[PDB]
Amino acid sequence: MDDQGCPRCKTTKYRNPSLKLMVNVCGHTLCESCVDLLFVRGAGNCPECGTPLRKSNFRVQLFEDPTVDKEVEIRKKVLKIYNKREEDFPSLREYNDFLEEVE
Amino acid sequence: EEDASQLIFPKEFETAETLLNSEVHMLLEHRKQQNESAEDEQELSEVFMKTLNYTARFSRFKNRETIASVRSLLLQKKLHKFELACLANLCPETAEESKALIPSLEGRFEDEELQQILDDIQTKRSFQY
Amino acid sequence: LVNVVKYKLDHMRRRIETDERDSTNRASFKCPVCSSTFTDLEANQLFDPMTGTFRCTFCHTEVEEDESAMPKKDARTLLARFNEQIEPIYALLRETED
Amino acid sequence: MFYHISLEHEILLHPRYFGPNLLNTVKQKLFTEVEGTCTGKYGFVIAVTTIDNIGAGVIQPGRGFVLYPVKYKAIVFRPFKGEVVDAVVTQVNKVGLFTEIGPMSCFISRHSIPSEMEFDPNSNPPCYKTMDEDIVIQQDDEIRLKIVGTRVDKNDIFAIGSLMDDYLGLV
Amino acid sequence: GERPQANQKRITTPYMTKYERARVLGTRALQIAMCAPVMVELEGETDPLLIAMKELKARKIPIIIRRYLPDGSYEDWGVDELIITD
Ligand SMILES: [Zn+2]
Ligand SMILES: [Zn+2]
Ligand SMILES: [Zn+2]
Fold first, then answer.
1. Most CB within 10 Å of its CB: which of A44, B88, C43, D37?
2. What is the count of residue pairs from D and E with beta carbons less than 8 Å apart?
3. What phi and psi, each to the nearest 5 degrees, are found at residue B67?
């Protein structure tokens, strides 16, 4: 929980166990405290690089979904452009051999 | 408090008619004609010249009936009086740019119908003067 | 006694959050000559285009900060981490009651 | 935002300023009084459209002037929290950017400015240019910002803005 | 329309009272003293109390008496519709 770090406020996880955490598109985890604290100071920029955040692309949740950063990125990359490939490949393949390349 | 992102408007500015740049510039142009073709004896002020120049600097329309046509297509949908002027005065280009200016627009209708709405706005947009 | 201890823990945790939230939003301009606390909503009238700096109202003096003691852009981290120090000193007492 | 509602204000006329047409004297004085001012409830009155109805003459003791409850419809300007409009850069300072939207003055703090557009005090004209010199935002430029907090004051209303938002710059 | 009812039925006799004569003579004297157009023709006088008295006999003073009723309504009266009493 507190081992992944915190961007701006840095003092929020130690104040409330049932904290509402959010995610973005580049691949970070920002709680609800960093959303309002960064908007009154700047806007929607990535604390590490430069990722613009205009639309409401935040997924609010209080169950602590992003546990491991490795298993949360593979679930978003498949349900984006790889989920649409589940129909085009069966229209040309003939054996279970090319499906191992997608995995 | 008042908030334009969540449509938090008071009881006085809830059902008020909004105006854009070319509309105010048109009404202020009639006041200029009353000073050139009549003049009377009283002189105006510099504030009227600065306001008239600022409206024409950001204006994008010309004809009178053309402006009222833009505020017509942006009303039949589930929108608001504030969201109507933001999509008519600024004249958005793409469908994704419209939602970037209004936070309360993403939680409405899809972008399939919004693309056809902006087609009429860009058609009547005066590219040159 | 079980609920009385938990009653004070909710007010002691919110007292630091209230005193910190009511201290970051105040001011950030003060003249070191006339000792006048200015705000950020008056920068359009306290500016002089012939010098590029800020001035005052009834006098022509240069302003500075606003007494560095409030949680500013950099001093907020020093005061925010003080609330996290309550967890290690009370973890032996909170884990037992939980 | 430019609105169009009905306004009601008590106009005082001097007893000597009557003339032949009494209705024409009150109308000519209305345009040279309510215009250019601003209120905390209606907004910045620019000009009066069409005169609606004109009341009678109310006379009160101890006040020799005459009052006419003239009802009209004038345009106003009341900014709200969250409006995205364009601005014109007037002054550029190392502390913050000074922009103005017509008769309204704005303000952009330093923390709302990206680190790429850093202030360069070397050259004489102040501007906010990037490291690779891509865009240059100097005096008298058409930019875009978002209103953060509004404030009314006699006539010159205040409305702080931000620049860190996306889809801004020279439009 | 919900309060002024002077264009239908009037109950008070059309006659000027001693209270209305004092206000008309006092209000008109203050207006003329502040440079006001004389309704009648001046013959050569400078007393402000006499100018307003001469205009009262000529019933040319453009004022309307608004008598507020104690119930909540009010009635209107003119100079020509009220005969002065001396
Ligand atoms: Zn945080
Ligand atoms: Zn990043
Ligand atoms: Zn000073």
1. B88
2. 16
3. -70, -45
CATH fold of B1-126 = Growth Hormone; Chain: A; (1.20.1250)
What CATH superfamily is the domain E5-86?
Answer: RNA polymerase subunit, RPB6/omega (3.90.940.10)
Range of the domain at C13: 4-24+73-98
The answer to whether C31 is a known ligand-binding residue is: yes
Q: A touches D (3+ CB pairs < 8 Å)?
A: yes
How far does Cα B56 stand from its chain's mean position? 13
Phi, psi of D7 (to 5 degrees): -120, 145
Q: d(Cα B95, Cα B82) in Å, to the nearest integer?
A: 18
Tell me which residue of D86, B98, D106, D110 sits closest to A54, measured CA to CA.
B98
Query: Which CATH code fits D81-171?
Result: 2.40.50.140
CB contact under 8 A, E36 and D59: no
Name the experimental technique: cryo-EM
Contact between A10 and C83 using a beta-carbon 8 Å cutoff: no
User: Chains near D, with 3+ CB pairs < 8 A?
Assistant: A, B, C, E
Which ligand has its closest atom nearest to the C-alpha of A53?
Answer: 2
Centre a 10 Å sphere on the Cβ of residue B125 and count the other Cβ atoms it contains.
Answer: 13
Output helix, strand, coil percentages for chain A, rounded to the nearest 5.
30, 5, 65
CATH number assigned to the domain covering D1-80 = 3.30.1490.120
User: How is residue D46 written in tokens?
Assistant: 């620019």
Resolution value (Å, 1 decimal)? 7.2
B111 is written with which tokens?
Answer: 């972008």
For residue A77, how far is its CA from the centre of ligand 1 (angstroms)?
Answer: 25
**Residue A47's Cα: distance from chain center in Å?**
14
- Distance, in Å, from the CA atom of B110 to the CA atom of B113, rounded to the nearest integer, reads 6
